[model samples]
Target: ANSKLTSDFDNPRWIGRHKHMFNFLDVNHNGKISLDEMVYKASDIVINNLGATPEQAKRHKDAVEAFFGGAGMKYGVETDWPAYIEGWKKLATDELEKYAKNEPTLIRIWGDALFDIVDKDQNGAITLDEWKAYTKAAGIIQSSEDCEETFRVCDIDESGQLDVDEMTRQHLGFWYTMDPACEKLYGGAVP
Candidate 1:
Protein backbone atom coordinates (compact mmCIF):
# COMPACT_ATOMS: atom_id res chain seq x y z
CA ALA A 1 0.00 0.00 0.00
CA ASN A 2 1.33 3.42 0.97
CA SER A 3 4.27 1.86 2.81
CA LYS A 4 5.46 0.20 -0.36
CA LEU A 5 5.84 3.66 -1.85
CA THR A 6 7.27 5.03 1.40
CA SER A 7 10.22 2.64 1.37
CA ASP A 8 11.45 3.99 -1.96
CA PHE A 9 11.89 7.45 -0.47
CA ASP A 10 14.10 6.35 2.45
CA ASN A 11 17.45 5.19 1.14
CA PRO A 12 20.13 7.74 0.40
CA ARG A 13 21.84 5.66 -2.27
CA TRP A 14 18.64 4.98 -4.14
CA ILE A 15 17.61 8.60 -3.71
CA GLY A 16 20.94 9.82 -5.05
CA ARG A 17 20.72 7.42 -7.97
CA HIS A 18 17.30 8.70 -9.03
CA LYS A 19 16.15 12.25 -9.95
CA HIS A 20 12.46 12.11 -10.75
CA MET A 21 11.37 12.61 -7.15
CA PHE A 22 13.66 15.62 -6.78
CA ASN A 23 12.51 17.11 -10.06
CA PHE A 24 8.91 16.61 -9.02
CA LEU A 25 9.50 18.32 -5.67
CA ASP A 26 11.17 21.31 -7.28
CA VAL A 27 7.77 22.41 -8.56
CA ASN A 28 8.80 25.96 -9.45
CA HIS A 29 11.16 24.41 -11.95
CA ASN A 30 13.98 26.06 -10.04
CA GLY A 31 17.25 24.27 -9.54
CA LYS A 32 17.21 25.01 -5.79
CA ILE A 33 14.42 24.30 -3.28
CA SER A 34 12.53 25.57 -0.21
CA LEU A 35 10.49 23.93 2.59
CA ASP A 36 7.16 25.36 1.36
CA GLU A 37 7.80 23.94 -2.08
CA MET A 38 8.69 20.66 -0.39
CA VAL A 39 5.26 20.39 1.24
CA TYR A 40 3.45 20.33 -2.05
CA LYS A 41 6.21 18.23 -3.45
CA ALA A 42 5.67 15.71 -0.68
CA SER A 43 2.00 15.52 -1.55
CA ASP A 44 2.72 15.08 -5.24
CA ILE A 45 5.31 12.50 -4.29
CA VAL A 46 2.80 10.47 -2.29
CA ILE A 47 0.41 10.48 -5.20
CA ASN A 48 2.81 9.92 -8.06
CA ASN A 49 5.36 7.65 -6.45
CA LEU A 50 2.68 5.43 -4.99
CA GLY A 51 1.04 5.09 -8.39
CA ALA A 52 -2.03 5.98 -6.39
CA THR A 53 -5.45 5.65 -7.86
CA PRO A 54 -8.12 8.20 -7.00
CA GLU A 55 -9.36 6.01 -4.17
CA GLN A 56 -5.89 5.55 -2.79
CA ALA A 57 -5.17 9.26 -3.02
CA LYS A 58 -8.35 9.94 -1.09
CA ARG A 59 -7.28 7.54 1.64
CA HIS A 60 -3.88 9.14 1.81
CA LYS A 61 -5.49 12.54 2.11
CA ASP A 62 -7.67 11.24 4.87
CA ALA A 63 -4.63 9.96 6.69
CA VAL A 64 -3.01 13.36 6.37
CA GLU A 65 -6.08 15.09 7.71
CA ALA A 66 -6.41 12.69 10.59
CA PHE A 67 -2.78 13.18 11.54
CA PHE A 68 -2.79 16.96 11.36
CA GLY A 69 -6.20 17.37 12.92
CA GLY A 70 -5.41 15.18 15.90
CA ALA A 71 -1.98 16.61 16.56
CA GLY A 72 -2.87 20.19 15.78
CA MET A 73 -5.83 20.12 18.13
CA LYS A 74 -3.89 18.49 20.92
CA TYR A 75 -1.40 21.31 20.92
CA GLY A 76 -4.24 23.86 21.08
CA VAL A 77 -3.06 25.61 17.97
CA GLU A 78 -4.69 26.05 14.61
CA THR A 79 -1.45 25.91 12.65
CA ASP A 80 1.40 23.94 14.09
CA TRP A 81 3.37 22.98 11.05
CA PRO A 82 5.90 20.96 12.95
CA ALA A 83 3.29 19.07 14.90
CA TYR A 84 1.27 18.53 11.77
CA ILE A 85 4.27 17.16 10.00
CA GLU A 86 5.12 14.94 12.93
CA GLY A 87 1.61 13.63 12.70
CA TRP A 88 2.10 12.88 9.04
CA LYS A 89 5.27 11.00 9.89
CA LYS A 90 3.37 8.97 12.44
CA LEU A 91 0.64 8.17 10.00
CA ALA A 92 3.10 7.21 7.31
CA THR A 93 4.94 4.97 9.72
CA ASP A 94 1.74 3.35 10.83
CA GLU A 95 0.92 2.58 7.23
CA LEU A 96 4.39 1.18 6.68
CA GLU A 97 4.08 -1.13 9.70
CA LYS A 98 1.35 -3.10 7.99
CA TYR A 99 3.46 -3.74 4.93
CA ALA A 100 6.66 -4.53 6.80
CA LYS A 101 5.11 -7.30 8.87
CA ASN A 102 7.01 -9.96 6.98
CA GLU A 103 10.40 -8.41 7.53
CA PRO A 104 12.67 -10.22 10.01
CA THR A 105 13.80 -7.22 11.96
CA LEU A 106 12.00 -4.36 13.69
CA ILE A 107 14.21 -1.58 12.50
CA ARG A 108 12.95 1.08 10.14
CA ILE A 109 13.58 -0.13 6.63
CA TRP A 110 13.64 2.65 4.13
CA GLY A 111 13.98 2.52 0.40
CA ASP A 112 15.40 -1.01 0.30
CA ALA A 113 13.36 -2.13 -2.67
CA LEU A 114 13.95 1.01 -4.71
CA PHE A 115 17.70 0.53 -4.29
CA ASP A 116 17.48 -2.78 -6.08
CA ILE A 117 15.91 -1.16 -9.12
CA VAL A 118 18.37 1.73 -9.17
CA ASP A 119 21.40 -0.55 -9.05
CA LYS A 120 20.25 -2.13 -12.37
CA ASP A 121 23.45 -4.01 -13.24
CA GLN A 122 23.42 -6.06 -10.02
CA ASN A 123 27.09 -5.16 -9.60
CA GLY A 124 26.48 -4.16 -5.96
CA ALA A 125 27.49 -0.64 -7.07
CA ILE A 126 26.07 2.36 -8.86
CA THR A 127 28.14 4.67 -11.01
CA LEU A 128 27.26 8.23 -11.99
CA ASP A 129 26.87 7.19 -15.60
CA GLU A 130 24.52 4.43 -14.54
CA TRP A 131 22.46 6.87 -12.49
CA LYS A 132 22.20 9.33 -15.38
CA ALA A 133 21.15 6.69 -17.85
CA TYR A 134 18.53 5.33 -15.49
CA THR A 135 16.96 8.70 -14.76
CA LYS A 136 17.09 9.67 -18.43
CA ALA A 137 15.46 6.43 -19.43
CA ALA A 138 12.83 6.94 -16.74
CA GLY A 139 11.87 10.26 -18.41
CA ILE A 140 12.92 12.21 -15.32
CA ILE A 141 15.29 14.38 -17.34
CA GLN A 142 13.33 16.04 -20.07
CA SER A 143 16.15 18.10 -21.59
CA SER A 144 19.88 18.09 -22.03
CA GLU A 145 20.37 20.85 -19.46
CA ASP A 146 18.45 18.94 -16.81
CA CYS A 147 20.43 15.84 -17.59
CA GLU A 148 23.68 17.72 -17.14
CA GLU A 149 22.60 19.18 -13.81
CA THR A 150 21.46 15.78 -12.55
CA PHE A 151 24.77 14.30 -13.60
CA ARG A 152 26.64 16.97 -11.67
CA VAL A 153 24.78 16.20 -8.46
CA CYS A 154 24.88 12.41 -8.65
CA ASP A 155 28.58 12.51 -9.47
CA ILE A 156 29.36 13.55 -5.89
CA ASP A 157 33.04 12.61 -5.87
CA GLU A 158 33.73 14.45 -9.14
CA SER A 159 35.77 11.39 -10.05
CA GLY A 160 33.22 10.61 -12.79
CA GLN A 161 32.06 7.61 -10.76
CA LEU A 162 29.36 6.95 -8.16
CA ASP A 163 29.78 4.32 -5.53
CA VAL A 164 27.11 3.55 -2.95
CA ASP A 165 28.37 6.28 -0.64
CA GLU A 166 28.13 9.06 -3.20
CA MET A 167 24.73 7.98 -4.35
CA THR A 168 23.40 7.63 -0.80
CA ARG A 169 24.88 10.82 0.61
CA GLN A 170 23.68 13.10 -2.17
CA HIS A 171 20.14 11.83 -2.21
CA LEU A 172 17.18 13.76 -0.68
CA GLY A 173 15.83 10.46 0.56
CA PHE A 174 18.70 10.33 2.98
CA TRP A 175 17.51 13.58 4.48
CA TYR A 176 14.23 11.82 5.28
CA THR A 177 15.92 8.83 6.89
CA MET A 178 14.18 6.55 4.43
CA ASP A 179 16.94 4.64 2.75
CA PRO A 180 18.32 1.62 4.60
CA ALA A 181 21.55 1.79 2.61
CA CYS A 182 22.47 5.26 3.86
CA GLU A 183 24.46 4.40 6.98
CA LYS A 184 26.14 1.33 5.52
CA LEU A 185 26.99 3.14 2.31
CA TYR A 186 27.59 6.68 3.55
CA GLY A 187 28.60 6.31 7.18
CA GLY A 188 25.52 7.57 9.01
CA ALA A 189 24.48 10.65 7.06
CA VAL A 190 20.85 10.01 7.68
CA PRO A 191 19.34 11.91 10.60
Candidate 2:
Protein backbone atom coordinates (compact mmCIF):
# COMPACT_ATOMS: atom_id res chain seq x y z
CA ALA A 1 0.00 0.00 0.00
CA ASN A 2 1.12 3.59 -0.68
CA SER A 3 0.68 4.40 3.02
CA LYS A 4 3.22 1.71 3.89
CA LEU A 5 5.84 2.93 1.42
CA THR A 6 7.44 5.69 3.46
CA SER A 7 9.37 5.99 6.71
CA ASP A 8 7.36 6.26 9.91
CA PHE A 9 7.49 9.62 11.62
CA ASP A 10 9.95 9.69 14.51
CA ASN A 11 9.48 11.77 17.62
CA PRO A 12 12.15 14.40 18.04
CA ARG A 13 14.55 13.34 20.80
CA TRP A 14 16.00 16.74 21.55
CA ILE A 15 14.83 19.67 23.66
CA GLY A 16 11.49 20.16 21.87
CA ARG A 17 10.49 16.53 21.72
CA HIS A 18 6.87 15.67 20.81
CA LYS A 19 6.76 11.98 21.78
CA HIS A 20 3.23 11.92 23.10
CA MET A 21 1.90 13.81 20.09
CA PHE A 22 3.80 11.64 17.64
CA ASN A 23 2.36 8.49 19.20
CA PHE A 24 -1.10 10.03 18.99
CA LEU A 25 -0.57 10.55 15.24
CA ASP A 26 0.58 7.07 14.35
CA VAL A 27 -3.00 5.81 14.51
CA ASN A 28 -2.62 2.94 12.03
CA HIS A 29 -0.01 0.28 12.71
CA ASN A 30 1.08 0.21 9.08
CA GLY A 31 4.18 2.25 9.99
CA LYS A 32 3.73 5.03 7.45
CA ILE A 33 2.75 8.67 7.57
CA SER A 34 0.11 10.74 5.77
CA LEU A 35 -0.72 14.37 5.21
CA ASP A 36 -3.96 13.96 7.24
CA GLU A 37 -1.85 12.95 10.20
CA MET A 38 0.34 16.00 9.68
CA VAL A 39 -2.69 18.30 9.41
CA TYR A 40 -4.16 17.03 12.69
CA LYS A 41 -0.80 17.29 14.39
CA ALA A 42 -0.31 20.83 13.13
CA SER A 43 -3.82 21.77 14.24
CA ASP A 44 -3.08 20.56 17.75
CA ILE A 45 0.11 22.60 17.73
CA VAL A 46 -1.83 25.66 16.59
CA ILE A 47 -4.35 25.19 19.38
CA ASN A 48 -1.80 24.57 22.12
CA ASN A 49 0.95 26.95 21.13
CA LEU A 50 -0.88 29.60 19.14
CA GLY A 51 -3.89 29.78 21.49
CA ALA A 52 -6.63 28.88 19.05
CA THR A 53 -10.16 29.71 20.20
CA PRO A 54 -12.79 27.08 20.97
CA GLU A 55 -14.65 27.96 17.77
CA GLN A 56 -11.45 27.59 15.76
CA ALA A 57 -10.80 24.24 17.43
CA LYS A 58 -14.34 23.14 16.65
CA ARG A 59 -13.96 24.08 12.99
CA HIS A 60 -10.72 22.13 12.74
CA LYS A 61 -12.30 19.14 14.43
CA ASP A 62 -15.27 19.35 12.10
CA ALA A 63 -13.04 19.22 9.07
CA VAL A 64 -11.30 16.11 10.36
CA GLU A 65 -14.57 14.51 11.38
CA ALA A 66 -16.29 15.20 8.08
CA PHE A 67 -13.33 13.87 6.13
CA PHE A 68 -13.20 10.67 8.16
CA GLY A 69 -16.96 10.21 8.20
CA GLY A 70 -17.26 10.53 4.45
CA ALA A 71 -14.30 8.23 3.88
CA GLY A 72 -15.66 5.65 6.29
CA MET A 73 -19.07 5.67 4.65
CA LYS A 74 -17.64 5.42 1.15
CA TYR A 75 -15.30 2.56 2.05
CA GLY A 76 -17.42 0.82 4.67
CA VAL A 77 -18.16 -1.88 2.16
CA GLU A 78 -14.41 -2.66 1.81
CA THR A 79 -12.27 -4.26 4.49
CA ASP A 80 -8.80 -4.02 2.93
CA TRP A 81 -6.07 -1.63 4.01
CA PRO A 82 -5.51 -0.36 0.48
CA ALA A 83 -9.15 0.58 0.08
CA TYR A 84 -9.16 2.29 3.43
CA ILE A 85 -6.12 4.39 2.53
CA GLU A 86 -7.53 5.21 -0.88
CA GLY A 87 -10.63 6.64 0.77
CA TRP A 88 -8.49 8.58 3.22
CA LYS A 89 -6.35 9.88 0.39
CA LYS A 90 -9.40 11.22 -1.43
CA LEU A 91 -10.42 13.16 1.63
CA ALA A 92 -6.89 14.43 2.19
CA THR A 93 -6.52 15.42 -1.46
CA ASP A 94 -9.73 17.44 -1.42
CA GLU A 95 -8.72 19.28 1.76
CA LEU A 96 -5.22 19.92 0.46
CA GLU A 97 -6.60 21.26 -2.81
CA LYS A 98 -8.67 23.74 -0.86
CA TYR A 99 -5.85 24.58 1.53
CA ALA A 100 -3.34 25.19 -1.24
CA LYS A 101 -5.51 27.99 -2.56
CA ASN A 102 -4.88 29.91 0.68
CA GLU A 103 -1.14 29.31 0.74
CA PRO A 104 1.23 32.06 -0.35
CA THR A 105 3.14 30.41 -3.14
CA LEU A 106 5.17 33.55 -3.75
CA ILE A 107 6.29 33.55 -0.13
CA ARG A 108 7.25 29.90 -0.41
CA ILE A 109 9.26 30.71 -3.53
CA TRP A 110 11.14 33.50 -1.78
CA GLY A 111 11.68 31.39 1.28
CA ASP A 112 13.15 28.56 -0.79
CA ALA A 113 15.39 31.05 -2.58
CA LEU A 114 16.61 32.43 0.73
CA PHE A 115 17.26 28.92 2.01
CA ASP A 116 19.30 28.20 -1.11
CA ILE A 117 21.35 31.35 -0.56
CA VAL A 118 22.17 30.48 3.07
CA ASP A 119 22.97 26.92 2.13
CA LYS A 120 25.98 28.10 0.18
CA ASP A 121 28.76 25.63 -0.63
CA GLN A 122 25.70 23.86 -2.15
CA ASN A 123 26.14 21.14 0.42
CA GLY A 124 22.43 20.64 1.09
CA ALA A 125 23.21 21.37 4.74
CA ILE A 126 24.10 24.30 6.96
CA THR A 127 25.88 24.26 10.29
CA LEU A 128 24.92 26.57 13.16
CA ASP A 129 28.01 28.69 12.56
CA GLU A 130 27.26 28.76 8.86
CA TRP A 131 23.69 29.86 9.51
CA LYS A 132 24.86 32.61 11.82
CA ALA A 133 27.38 33.83 9.30
CA TYR A 134 24.84 33.80 6.48
CA THR A 135 22.20 35.60 8.50
CA LYS A 136 24.72 38.18 9.60
CA ALA A 137 25.86 38.67 6.05
CA ALA A 138 22.23 39.06 5.00
CA GLY A 139 21.69 41.64 7.75
CA ILE A 140 18.84 39.63 9.25
CA ILE A 141 20.42 39.79 12.69
CA GLN A 142 22.25 43.01 13.39
CA SER A 143 23.34 42.24 16.96
CA SER A 144 25.32 39.34 18.43
CA GLU A 145 22.61 38.78 21.04
CA ASP A 146 19.96 38.35 18.33
CA CYS A 147 22.16 35.85 16.48
CA GLU A 148 22.76 33.93 19.70
CA GLU A 149 19.03 33.54 20.31
CA THR A 150 18.49 32.48 16.71
CA PHE A 151 21.23 29.91 17.10
CA ARG A 152 19.67 28.63 20.31
CA VAL A 153 16.33 28.14 18.55
CA CYS A 154 17.88 26.06 15.77
CA ASP A 155 20.40 24.17 17.83
CA ILE A 156 18.05 21.89 19.74
CA ASP A 157 20.89 19.80 21.19
CA GLU A 158 22.90 22.81 22.45
CA SER A 159 25.82 21.16 20.65
CA GLY A 160 26.69 24.40 18.85
CA GLN A 161 26.02 22.75 15.47
CA LEU A 162 22.92 22.40 13.27
CA ASP A 163 22.44 19.30 11.15
CA VAL A 164 20.06 18.72 8.23
CA ASP A 165 17.75 16.57 10.32
CA GLU A 166 17.38 19.41 12.82
CA MET A 167 16.67 21.89 10.04
CA THR A 168 14.15 19.58 8.39
CA ARG A 169 12.43 19.01 11.74
CA GLN A 170 12.03 22.77 12.00
CA HIS A 171 10.48 22.88 8.49
CA LEU A 172 13.47 24.64 6.95
CA GLY A 173 13.78 23.22 3.46
CA PHE A 174 17.36 24.10 2.63
CA TRP A 175 18.45 20.54 2.04
CA TYR A 176 16.91 19.30 -1.17
CA THR A 177 16.54 15.51 -1.24
CA MET A 178 17.68 15.29 -4.85
CA ASP A 179 19.02 18.39 -6.54
CA PRO A 180 21.76 18.73 -9.12
CA ALA A 181 23.48 21.40 -7.06
CA CYS A 182 23.41 19.13 -4.01
CA GLU A 183 24.79 16.17 -5.96
CA LYS A 184 27.54 18.32 -7.47
CA LEU A 185 28.68 19.72 -4.11
CA TYR A 186 27.98 17.10 -1.45
CA GLY A 187 29.36 13.86 -2.92
CA GLY A 188 26.99 11.40 -1.19
CA ALA A 189 23.76 11.94 0.72
CA VAL A 190 22.05 15.29 0.13
CA PRO A 191 22.50 16.16 3.79
Error of 1 at 6 (Å): 21
Off by over 4 Å in 1: 1-112, 137-139, 154-159, 172-191
Model 2 Cα lDDT, one tens digit per residue, 57-157? 55554454454454442322322344444454453344334334554222233334334434445344565566656544433344555555544556445
Runs of candidate 2 exceeding 4 Å displacement: 1-104, 121-123, 155-191
Can you give the lDDT of residue 14 in candidate 2?
Answer: 16
- Model 1 per-residue lDDT tens digits across residues 1-191: 22333444344444453243445544556654444333343346445653445654554444433433433323223333334344435544554454346432111222222333445553435555555554444444545555455444454444454555444333423333354443322222112
**TM-score, every prediction:** 0.31, 0.27
Candidate 1 has an lDDT of 0.41
Give per-candidate clash totals. 7, 0
Candidate 2, run of 10 with poorest lDDT: 1-10
